[PDB]
Design a protein around this ligand. Structure first.
Ligand SMILES: Nc1ncnc2c1ncn2[C@@H]1O[C@H](COP(=O)(O)OP(=O)(O)OP(=O)(O)O)[C@@H](O)[C@H]1O
Ligand SMILES: Nc1ncnc2c1ncn2[C@@H]1O[C@H](COP(=O)(O)OP(=O)(O)OP(=O)(O)O)[C@@H](O)[C@H]1O
Ligand SMILES: Nc1ncnc2c1ncn2[C@@H]1O[C@H](COP(=O)(O)OP(=O)(O)OP(=O)(O)O)[C@@H](O)[C@H]1O
Ligand SMILES: Nc1ncnc2c1ncn2[C@@H]1O[C@H](COP(=O)(O)OP(=O)(O)OP(=O)(O)O)[C@@H](O)[C@H]1O
Ligand SMILES: Nc1ncnc2c1ncn2[C@@H]1O[C@H](COP(=O)(O)OP(=O)(O)OP(=O)(O)O)[C@@H](O)[C@H]1O
Ligand SMILES: [Mg+2]
Ligand SMILES: [Mg+2]
Ligand SMILES: [Mg+2]
Ligand SMILES: [Mg+2]
Ligand SMILES: [Mg+2]
Ligand SMILES: [Mg+2]
Lengths: 302, 299, 296, 290, 302, 302
């Protein structure tokens, strides 16, 4: 058994994740897991833990539709695509581009809406100082993904785990990467198991690992209409002026703005728009003023 | 388990920090911690460890007000800002500018007055020779900040921690930076956790790491009025001449002077003004005059 | 495990330095040190190791007086300077100027006669190939300097230690310098701890690192009176003829002439004045003629 | 490597053979790595007597280097009579700075660290600085020590921000250990170079005694020719060494050695041909010159 | 019940060693031994087992004399040294240095000529998988050494038995080392019991164990005169040509050679010198050819 | 006894090897063994298990002769070498060099022709997860090698065992190496026991272990004549065309080829020559085809 994951809170988290998985998939109750796979179970992300929905992603509607029709529907609905063997889901999916464009939000929406079991694994859980523990951890990760047959394995910042191999790499790290390469695509074919990765450095990933991510989505910087959609999504459920507000000017004048930059701009604009409301409530501890174009003009450069 | 948290002095420091945190926040007694989180607990900076007040900072009054209204109140008073989802605290805060302008001063004031639990982590504690211990250290730091729900993780000199990723980066360093990037903004959203960093080289920070510091404060070189306020703050509770001392001359003639430079100038002026009293004591302090400050100023 | 000690000679040196520190300051016997702090302990210079005092430095009398009144008395006498918040010792001290002007011996006299526990770190001990050990070494150094509360950390040739940070800098060195800047002036204030450096390239020092050295002493090339004082200091307990010796002329003829060069000139004058005496030993007082013979 | 450890054992054996008191001295691993670069008088075949044309320079070098470092008891009356911290042998190339270093290593017999930049330089982080520290510590342990760095202008070049990090830190550590607070014993580092101006002033101060081994004069060239042409048959009537010395104008020691070697080979060429199947004269010397 | 030495041959060896000890010391017949002490008795080195004499060690005459005057005579002749309490033998002796210099030769000479009962214990005879057996083995070893009152306990390669303690040490190893420390120098003072140890890595030994070895002997690499003495000892009772052999030249040109290296060189030189005699004996010249210098030069790098 | 000797087929193998040893040496009937010695018995290589003859090794005739007169004859014929005490067999033999040059062939020929009892033991059978079992295993290994008095303890890849000692070594591994050092050359002298090692990285062996291997054979890369002899002995009992096959050129162009490389080249050339005959045999020319230079050169680089 793995020496890590023996904590009482760890066991409680594993039991909680297993109960959630069994509640979502009743057929999962007949599946028995190893101790290593039970340790991997703590990295499962349920739909509940995610508050991001595909409707909360703006400016990526063609990308969202392509991701659905090429990733989610083949993986989650194999009966429709069973007519031809070339209609299967890809073994790997890579979301790459400049930071802040929505790769992590797309991964969150995949965790929430796809319906596939999701493992958001981090390298802290994979790495272990003891000999041979990391290889068994990856083996358990792949075996658990095979057991929860429609599974997605997510590795955020995948350019570090799947970095280019070299002689200067650590022996345990190199063996771990080789084991991941073998289990990803080897003699024993996986089931409906997909490894989804998000990264900013596309060229830092090993060629043998980039080959295992054949479906690549370029979440690039948003355009003017894309920025308008992102701003409309961010400024949803937030009151805006019916006459003075002009979202087109904000979308056009945010040249070279990522989604996170637009989120910070919206947060700042809402803060200085409601400053009067926080001033009133701080004395106690009316209504928040609808957002105006001018509030965006002060914190933008024209 | 972890490494370097097993020393008796280290365990005593962890127990002291946990006791201070529980005393400050009585609801924190029910929180249980892993051994890695206990190791991170030695990096906790409590308000009693900081002697620096927000009123002890001069020349940054609009910066202090903006930092308050956009950082502290959304983080520490979510009930006021709960009406709208866009009124939340920033994911990260960067205090960047020329050295000596008061970035560490603002960080100390945040550690003392914000009321947020504060972790001042240094990369000596994060780094570990053993394999995979540093990634677990990062994960423990983030989980501890999540448990102490209004937490601020402070990383002084964040340009080295968040350096731009390269193919020549060390494998442990690169995996550590990727793990910090994932936990900073990933699938599992953090609570009221904000990472505050101070740096002189903002360009050395990675673009994806500058992404996670969306609220940026430029603590630039002080102006004439800013120098006036800084020198007035430094010379507080220190005797000054009523008629023979003029401070506007010192503020105007200290062109291109940071707060540290003004502190050193004030220290030298006090030293060679009270040298006579020091010589008498070695065997009252004279009021400070503007002639003394002109003596120590090259102009 | 710092991997820098763990040797019989290293452990013996560390125990010797700790015994000397406890003998100098009896209050240190209750202080417990970590393994990394014990590794740092080997770089500690006790006053008995230094054979140079303040009376062996000449031509820099107002620099010695200013260094005393601005470094030693604020640091070693807190009760005298406790009246005002602007009378504390500096967080850093920089000795800069042309080489051979008297900065290394000034640091020697600081290690000998100031009274503070003295740490003369060389970058080789700090530079460790293993991951994260250099930063732990720096942290242990700062914690040990805080434990021995009156302390001075000396970095000779601080220009390369505190060089300007760049993208071409190694990752371990960049984190080392960042950790040094954090512990030098960060959230956790140091005690009576200051960092003193002697260098010849002040411009090579990083601006943020130069900021942490606010009390900067400029040791320039000596003047005529300064060179005369240096020659008088270098010629003590030696035979000088009353009528023949003219030290003033030797002082003026040494234009642009450093203290190390003054030592070299004095040692060459002694050599070619006592050549006959040492030849008789194997088998003449110092005058202006022999000094001007070596000079040009 | 096995060969490196064998070389270290070789040098250690030779040094304890010369100095019986060195058996109790313990060495660090980096100290043994430095000891691998230590040369001995046995492998050097050049004597101070073989240094012709530099008699006044040889006498001054002896008086300022050999005796104050080998006889502390004679010079113990005055601290100013001690050996210098560094000695620089600068001048035009081919004048015999390297052979001066070999004669210094041989006749003095000191523990000679004839060390190079390649042995100091290492790819791993912090290795070169530890190498320099162990070099100076080993020089402190073997108290009669001279450290030689041939072509020291490249090693002690002017410091700049353009310099690489590792070599700049290396130069800073060498600067610290050359004259620092932990004062060395009878340790003296000697450099031979052709570009004295290329050496940093901070390193210039650390070689206070300098040696200008210059272009030989007519008498100096005659002494060089007389010294290097020993154990050779010369016809008394035919030979005229003064004319040969006066003919070579502006010729370095290396040029004189090459000219004499060419003349001797041309003289002995006939004999070699006969073996396969004559004394040296002024005509062969004058014919080679243009 | 020690569960070791239960075999018939081990019991026979124990009985033979006890008989030899009783023959050597007639007063030893009154001593009754426990079963664990009988198990320790298998490690007794009676001097007839050793063939090495002190004379058989060359180049260590000052070391041999110092070892005698400071180790053997204070231990074996306490009547002479009983005038002052500071003249007793040390509680431990460490022989350290590069391998092949003669530490085991000195230990063999001590086993053969000192006259002290010698126990050459090994880690296999100490370690036991059963609980608490190894500590009882060490206790029996110390009690037996006390019973055979002039005794020497030898632990070859002592850097492994007395390695530096750590929290990563095995429980039985840490308990064993603590028990050895307690019995070595504790409340109950030992008799004329000395723990002589030979090692190559003195720095690997624990500081608390190096303390219990206060008399340290450095058997370093031999010098030219020392190598000449070693070669003279090794080439004794061997035919060498008077006119042709030059031992001094071989001693100079065997630079950086340990005693074992010189032994191997002498063996190879004698082999290639006598090869003719072996070639003549295999057919079944005459007498063995006396060894000359060239037989050593051909096997030397020089 | 340990857990290794409790298996049924392991006990059968041990009984078979003991029967073979008694059949080869009739004096071995009276010798009895401990349980650990019986487990060591399973690592003993009988000469009939080896199909490699000293004549099967080509190009190493000077090395084979030197190995014989310096290693085998002193060990196997002590009556001939008993006139001089310096003619004994070395305590250790090291075969080092680039891989594929014939070190394992030399060890096989030593196992089959030398006549010594051969212990070719691997480190898995030495290592044990239990406390102190590895030390007892090596102690029984040396005791058994002493009982079968002419014995060879061969450890292939001797660099992994006998590696340079370090503080990062496992405690059981460190005690194992120390026990091997003590039994190899300690107080209790071994009989005609010699440890033969084969390795590629001679520098990885510890200095104290390299000392215990004084006789060293450098099996370097074959030269032109050496490669000619290796190809001649590899192409034995094989039909070769007298007129067309010129082995000298094939020996000339295999620059840098080891013995394994020449073996693979010969195998490929033989397969290419016999492809037609083998295809014909699968359907059932009718005779084998003599080898030619063209088949060897087509696999080679001119
Ligand atoms: N398409 C989008 N629509 C609305 N908001 C977005 C979009 N993309 C990004 N954001 C905002 O940016 C923030 C972070 O985005 P995200 O973490 O997905 O970036 P990323 O492209 O994955 O970069 P990184 O790989 O560095 O995390 C989110 O909190 C979100 O509010
Ligand atoms: N704005 C200010 N008002 C008053 N004092 C100041 C100010 N800025 C700096 N100082 C003085 O300078 C000292 C150090 O300042 P601080 O460490 O905050 O500089 P910094 O901007 O963080 O630069 P660095 O990041 O290089 O440390 C403080 O002790 C403080 O007394
Ligand atoms: N002011 C002085 N009085 C007497 N001797 C001096 C003086 N300055 C330098 N010296 C001589 O120089 C040596 C000390 O070196 P010094 O302190 O000059 O180095 P430095 O100025 O720090 O230059 P660097 O930074 O290159 O080390 C002593 O041996 C001493 O003889
Ligand atoms: N001083 C010596 N005189 C004669 N022979 C020696 C001497 N030292 C070593 N030898 C030869 O070396 C062989 C083994 O030496 P020994 O085992 O004593 O080495 P060691 O120093 O104990 O190294 P290790 O601890 O690795 O065994 C002996 O058989 C002996 O022939
Ligand atoms: N001299 C030789 N004559 C004939 N065949 C040889 C010779 N040397 C090697 N070979 C062939 O090489 C093969 C490999 O065995 P070999 O003895 O070369 O291993 P080795 O040299 O010890 O290399 P390693 O160290 O990798 O085991 C053998 O099957 C043998 O057929
Ligand atoms: Mg992301
Ligand atoms: Mg700061
Ligand atoms: Mg200096
Ligand atoms: Mg031994
Ligand atoms: Mg005790
Ligand atoms: Mg093999």
């Amino acid at each position: 058994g793995p020496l890590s994951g023996k904590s009482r809170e760890s066991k409680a988290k594993q039991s909680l994740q297993w109960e959630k998985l069994v509640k979502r998939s009743p057929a999962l109750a007949e599946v028995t897991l190893d101790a290593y796979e039970r340790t991997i179970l703590s990295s499962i992300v349920t739909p509940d833990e995610i508050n991001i929905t595909f409707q909360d992603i703006g400016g990526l509607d063609p990308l969202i539709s392509d991701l659905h029709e090429s990733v989610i529907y083949p993986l989650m609905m194999p009966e429709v695509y069973s007519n031809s063997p070339l209609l299967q889901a890809p073994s790997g999916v890579l979301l790459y581009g400049p930071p802040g464009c929505g790769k992590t939000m797309l991964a969150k929406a995949l965790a929430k809406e796809s319906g596939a079991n999701f493992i958001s694994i981090r390298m802290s859980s994979i790495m272990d100082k003891w000999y041979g523990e990391s290889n068994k951890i990856v083996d358990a990760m792949f075996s658990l993904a095979n057991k929860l047959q429609p599974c997605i394995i997510f590795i955020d910042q995948i350019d570090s785990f799947l970095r280019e191999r070299s002689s200067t790499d650590h022996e345990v790290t190199a063996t771990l990467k080789a084991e991941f390469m073998t289990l990803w695509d080897g003699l024993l074919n996986n089931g409906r198991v997909m490894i989804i990765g998000a990264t900013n450095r596309i060229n830092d990933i090993d060629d043998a690992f980039l080959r295992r991510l054949p479906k690549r989505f370029l979440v690039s910087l948003p355009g003017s209409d894309q920025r308008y959609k992102i701003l409309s999504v961010l400024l949803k459920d937030t009151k805006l002026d019916e006459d003075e507000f002009d979202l087109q000017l904000i979308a056009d004048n945010t040249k070279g703005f990522s989604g996170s930059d637009l989120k910070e701009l919206c947060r700042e604009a809402a803060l200085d728009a409601a400053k009067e409301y926080i001033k009133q409530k701080r004395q106690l501890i009316l209504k928040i003023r609808p957002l105006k174009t001018k509030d965006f003009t002060k914190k933008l450069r024209m």
